[PDB]
């Protein structure tokens, strides 16, 4: 449906009220079923209207006009629903033509630390709610971890690159508002081993299937066997994978043993039978002689001499029958024994080449989580799985920077302004920053509220890049320590001509060792110009930041030469190498759920700080210090949509506080 699809595109259940709605509409959710369905339709319909034309503001009046009775009956209910949606940035978010120009008279003052997507998203919302907003940004540009390389026609993202599907994605709305060239990524991606030989199709399929079975196993190990603590330490995903692999090797050996153990049991039956047949052949030989000697006595003979020939004859045919029965039994044990030799169990669980290809699939997983599998929480690494968007993953051919730059229009942004200290008290806040170009030039910003969008990497930095006065409480700092901040680098290779298959978007390279599975393990072809993008993931990312760009472009050309041949691979016109861990305004790529952490720490990061009272015995103050960014959004972490949504959330929480609900 259209109304049901709007709820889906807004990440809302169409047929039920959310916790957030229950809080703002307690009268309704606590009351009659019919009023709830009316509420839900008004909500769903208002969303549909916004989603169908997100380039122009949806007013309350415009909403009421396009509602049919009995839903347009209650004008206050429609106004409450519209207002709620606008406040929480479900409608009239991003970049849209405003119908009624913003009032000149501004209420309240907010400093936003960082002009990343989380910052910019919040700033727009707050400004449009009639607050005074200033963003402080350390860099000479907006966008933060959305960073696009540009030299002439060459365009390549060193940061965010992929829209992870449009189904329920708020970047779907943004893509209609901004001109982003979204190009579907073809799932097909061939591998190429150390030498440059494509993995044969049948083998590729076998290792991939084994990877998915190994993951499914870690999940079984986690949820069913409750193997989540080992030696009073949280179990890593890497540890679980080691243990699952070992148990698969352990089974292969156990299988061989049981098979050879049943061969010896058969060989011992045969041995015991052959001994019986050898002893019986001797007794048959002796008894034949006795009969021969008895028959050598020519007639005429007495009856005892006749009886001796007859008795020995009878006895010899009897023993010859036994030997014929045993010889049959021997013949069928020799069939069984030859069949067991024909159908042995598997020699090894995984070949050396298989383990190298499996390491590429682990590298892929280390890329996605931007961390070694030894750091990921077994239980919670995938805790956000139920909220993944539907639809094909897309790239931004424009360069993703087009989004922040668009969001930055009409916003008071101080670039080259590095926040050093954040002060928060019952009466308000001072943010102390310096000029990045000359550290001596000091700036002081006085505000009612501070929105911190500092990356988790920065919040983690010891000794601190940013000092909080008073210091952040133990519950906040403990969350910052616990939570993982990963790393992931990109090598941008700009050529004069396409020497690769244009219909293939990705292709892997398999490393020699486990230790280097992440090193230039994947190549992207998503751009119009001839550009190849190489990922450095896992343990390799951290180490490859000390190695120079020439050596890295070196190792890149080598790998490409091996796949397409020396004559096909020219020298690149332009090369760029990201170093996100070394970057002091990131200190890494994006968050992961570290062993010992959970989704709950993301919620702790989102919780605002309330200062103590100035004079003792003074009433409980209001919250002053708020937090947004990908590390603050439990259901969409380590993403642009997550950052976007975290901003919209804090804009609503801040407006609710300082303008009232």
């Amino acid at each position: 449906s259209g109304v049901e699809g709007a709820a889906f595109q807004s990440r809302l259940p169409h047929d039920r009220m959310t916790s957030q709605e229950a809080a703002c509409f307690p009268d309704i959710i606590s009351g009659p079923q019919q009023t709830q369905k009316v509420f839900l339709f008004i909500r769903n319909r208002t969303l549909q209207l916004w989603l169908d034309n997100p380039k122009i503001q949806l007013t309350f009046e415009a909403t009421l006009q396009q509602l049919e009775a009995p839903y347009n009956s209650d004008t206050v209910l429609v106004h409450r629903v519209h207002s709620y949606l606008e406040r929480h940035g479900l409608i009239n978010f991003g970049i849209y033509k405003r119908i009624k120009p913003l009032p000149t008279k501004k209420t309240g003052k907010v400093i936003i630390i960082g002009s990343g997507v989380s910052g910019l998203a919040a700033a727009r919302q707050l400004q449009s709610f009639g607050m005074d907003v200033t963003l402080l940004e350390a860099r000479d540009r907006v966008g933060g971890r959305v960073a696009t390389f540009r030299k002439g026609n060459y365009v390549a993202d060193l940061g965010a690159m992929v829209v992870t599907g449009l189904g329920g994605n708020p970047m779907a709305v943004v893509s209609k508002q901004v001109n982003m060239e979204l190009a579907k990524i073809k799932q097909k991606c061939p591998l190429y081993e150390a030498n440059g030989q494509a993995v044969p199709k049948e083998k590729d399929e076998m290792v991939e299937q084994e990877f998915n079975r190994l993951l499914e196993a870690t999940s079984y190990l986690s949820h069913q066997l409750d193997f989540n603590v080992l030696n009073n330490k949280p179990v890593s995903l890497g540890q679980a994978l080691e243990v699952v692999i070992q148990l698969q090797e352990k089974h292969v050996k156990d299988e061989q043993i049981e098979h050879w153990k049943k061969i010896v049991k058969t060989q011992e039956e045969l041995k015991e039978l052959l001994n019986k047949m050898v002893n019986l052949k001797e007794k048959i030989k002796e008894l034949h002689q006795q009969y021969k000697e008895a028959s050598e006595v020519k007639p005429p003979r007495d009856i005892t001499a006749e009886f001796l020939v007859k008795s020995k004859h009878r006895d010899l045919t009897a023993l010859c029958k036994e030997y014929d029965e045993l010889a049959e039994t021997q013949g069928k044990l020799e069939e069984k024994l030859q069949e067991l030799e024909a159908n042995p169990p598997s020699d090894v669980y995984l070949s050396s080449r298989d383990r190298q290809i499996l390491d590429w699939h682990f590298a892929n997983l280390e890329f996605a989580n931007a961390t070694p599998l030894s750091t990921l929480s077994l239980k919670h690494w995938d805790q956000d799985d139920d909220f993944e968007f539907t639809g094909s993953h897309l790239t931004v051919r424009n360069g993703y920077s087009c989004v922040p730059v668009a969001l930055a229009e009409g916003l008071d942004i101080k670039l080259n302004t590095a926040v050093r200290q954040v002060r928060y008290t019952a009466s308000g806040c001072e943010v102390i920053a310096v000029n990045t170009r000359s550290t001596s030039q000091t700036f002081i910003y006085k505000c009612d509220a501070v929105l911190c969008t500092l990356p988790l990497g920065v919040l983690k930095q010891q000794p601190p890049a940013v000092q909080f006065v008073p210091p952040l409480p133990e519950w906040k700092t403990s969350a910052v320590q616990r939570m993982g901040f990963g790393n992931l680098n990109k090598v941008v290779l700009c050529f004069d001509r396409v020497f690769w298959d244009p219909s293939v978007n990705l292709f892997g390279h398999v490393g020699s060792t486990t230790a280097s599975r992440g090193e230039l393990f994947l190549f992207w072809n998503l751009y119009k110009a001839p550009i190849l993008l190489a990922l450095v993931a896992g343990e390799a990312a951290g180490i490859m930041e000390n190695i120079s760009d020439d050596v890295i472009v070196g190792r890149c050309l080598a790998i490409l030469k091996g796949i397409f041949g020396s004559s096909a691979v020219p020298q690149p016109k332009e090369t760029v190498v990201s170093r996100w861990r070394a970057d002091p305004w990131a200190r890494g790529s994006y968050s992961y759920v570290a062993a010992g952490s959970s989704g709950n720490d993301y919620d702790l990061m989102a919780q605002p700080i309330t200062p103590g009272p100035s004079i003792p015995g003074a009433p409980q103050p209001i919250p002053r210090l708020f937090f947004a960014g990908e590390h603050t959004i439990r259901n969409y972490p380590a993403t642009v949509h997550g950052a976007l949504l975290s901003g919209l959330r804090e804009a609503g929480r801040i407006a609710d506080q300082f303008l009232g609900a």
């Binding site: 991939e208 890329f367 892997g508």
Partner: peptide, 9 residues
């Protein structure tokens, strides 16, 4: 996160 994985199946 998981969603970033290539050829996820």
């Amino acid at each position: 996160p998981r969603s970033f994985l290539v050829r996820k199946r």
